[PDB]
């Protein structure tokens, strides 16, 4: 019985080993919007007689 306790404690220590890490790489990334129209900013000014 006391041997099972000693053997169990050793197995607990051996099981404390770490395997790996996992993380997401998202820094520096931004979403993109879509502009549907082109701004021209033009107006045609014409006289009444058209000259």
């Amino acid at each position: 019985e006391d041997m099972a306790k000693i053997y169990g404690a050793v197995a607990a220590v051996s099981k404390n080993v770490n395997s790996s890490v996992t993380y997401e790489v998202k820094r520096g990334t931004h979403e993109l919007i879509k502009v549907p129209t082109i701004p021209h900013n033009l107006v045609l000014i014409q006289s009444d007689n058209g000259k």
């Binding site: 006391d2 000693i6 404690a9 050793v10 220590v13």
Partner: protein
């Protein structure tokens, strides 16, 4: 100055006989506990660095 004679009656000798069995039991348990703990340390832990 007021030393008194020690009386060793049957009750006191009988009481010590009970204590002798209790003392013998305690030593056996501690030896088993020491042996178990000494085995655990060797298998589990190791040296320490800085």
């Amino acid at each position: 100055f007021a030393l008194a004679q020690i009386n060793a009656d049957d009750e006191f000798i009988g009481a010590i006989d009970k204590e002798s069995a209790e003392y013998l039991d305690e030593y056996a348990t501690l030896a088993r506990d020491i042996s178990n703990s000494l085995t655990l340390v060797k298998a589990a832990f190791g040296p320490l660095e800085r």
